[PDB]
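Input for the complex:
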Amino acid sequence: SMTVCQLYAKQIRHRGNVKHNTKLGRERLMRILEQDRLGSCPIDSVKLSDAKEWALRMKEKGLSYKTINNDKRSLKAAFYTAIQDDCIRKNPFDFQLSDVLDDDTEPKVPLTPAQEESFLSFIQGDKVYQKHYDAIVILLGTGLKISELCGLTDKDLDFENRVIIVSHQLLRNTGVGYYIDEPKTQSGVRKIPMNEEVYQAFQRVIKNRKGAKPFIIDGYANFLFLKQNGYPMTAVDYGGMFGRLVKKYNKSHEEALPKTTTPHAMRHTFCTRLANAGMNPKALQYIMGHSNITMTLNYYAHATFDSARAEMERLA
Amino acid sequence: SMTVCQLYAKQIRHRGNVKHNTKLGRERLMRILEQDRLGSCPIDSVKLSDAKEWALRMKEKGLSYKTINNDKRSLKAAFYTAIQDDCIRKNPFDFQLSDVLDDDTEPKVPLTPAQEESFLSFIQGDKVYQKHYDAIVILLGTGLKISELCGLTDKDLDFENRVIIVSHQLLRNTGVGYYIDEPKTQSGVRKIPMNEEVYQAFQRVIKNRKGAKPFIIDGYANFLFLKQNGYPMTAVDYGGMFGRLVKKYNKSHEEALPKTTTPHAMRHTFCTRLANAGMNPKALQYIMGHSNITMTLNYYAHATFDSARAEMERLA
DNA sequence: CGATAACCTAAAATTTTATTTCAAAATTATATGGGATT
DNA sequence: AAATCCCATATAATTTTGATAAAATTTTAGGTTATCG
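Predicted:
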């Protein structure tokens, strides 16, 4: 592995136990190297300046900051493997990316209650999207990621105790089609309770289910949420639906919805509400399914001296 | 850097920008290496099996779990330096200490409200330790570490706004005597409000100050808390004082106080109270001085499904 | 008169804290084309 | 009839997510002194 492409090729073959989406992503970076001048350099000649100039090119190509930072970390790990193989001494990607580029990531603004009520009223009223009203309510009332919602089946709901049992996701990719991913341990499994509006939503979704094709994958069947074609919804299908729905909303409402009103924005709103209401962080972390509690805590506003003093006075 | 001792000696010389307590700690580990068989081995002959046996000896010697794990981290860093200088291949200290030793660290259980009210009652009434009643109230009402308390001077209190300005600590060591450690960035400096009890206790500390000798160090003078000898209290002095206070308490009380009832215990109790009361986690992280929000979240009890459900029901 | 409480402190130990991604794996945007509704 | 949604999906992109010890605190041992047994 003397060329950078060959080195990355060696890295991903050595670390092959990955998911289908990971194989796609690696392919995307491999194409970047093949097109970029950096992929041709021998690894023993790649200097810290070459890696930085690579980033400037990626930004000039039009790739976002988060993309360029993620790919930098892939390359960094690749060169750390060539270091442990006695090919080079220093790792030319061991620099801070913010020193070279500015992070212009557009913040993801959650929905405000006023907007949320407005957004839902439009959905239930609209004759084309009202059929998705139930899914949106469930998203907003549970924090489910989109492929966890798609993976729900009759065996995952418990209406006696009003609990959602989140144990897997249903995914779909080109070629392979549908498949099920689930956690290796029992930590990714969580149980989310249903409030009155979520409980009533699942009831409507089960009563109105119609036209299900014969479908079973990795032992899972009888999914709650189906496309018109009789097969279950996928993340992409909801993404596309949200885009058209938001576009239709902004045409008739003066105040448009945030630019990034996607399915995850429902999870973001759900988490922001609970945090600002002062939910026990460890409890919120359970509902959300976060592994590191740092993830959950990013949803709590930074504290100030006056912030803290108020809290201490509030607690005698 | 052929023997392990010579290697460690190189790791500390190359990384010399350390505080006095670090120099003491490294010296302690150096003694262990010089007394242990492992100190004599050539680094190119230290196998993973060898490092594990070192830990067994340390535990056989009587060193606690955390000590051995801390020292293991030191040795590991030293071998990463040798691996980066092309002296060895793999790091023989890259293993989980859990697999060799069990962690018998006795948990530090904080004071229950009933204990605290009893502990303070005894101090106020005791003819010998009543003079320290004020320092202990402040410890319990502010969460100050012990060397931050010893560092408090008139210029650090603000009785108008009733705020403590923590910006430094006062330390003392054999030979060097006293010195002041401040944070590099203004992130370690924080401000703590005074409750009635605490503000009332600072007034007593200043009215009763007596017998101060001329003393200024790194620009700091007029310290609130002083030994009988006219110089300020140090961490050690409060430690020994706490040790005798607890002994005298456990003689006249049936239910003894926790084994680890030290000055830091007061910081522990303070933090546990606010966490259990449901204080904003990031507001508590500010008051405490924790640099990472993970350190503060350790004081919150893990959540259960029932714990989480009751919280979501509470936030209708 | 002795034992030991109370302070002080050198020496020796334990405990509290410190920067944290050596990319995977998901989600979303978009171009296209064939129906359905303007 | 021209134009615009609505769905579905391949393709391409963005976003979410999962200790490489220093520096403090505390314990203890030995001595003096003051207090108590």
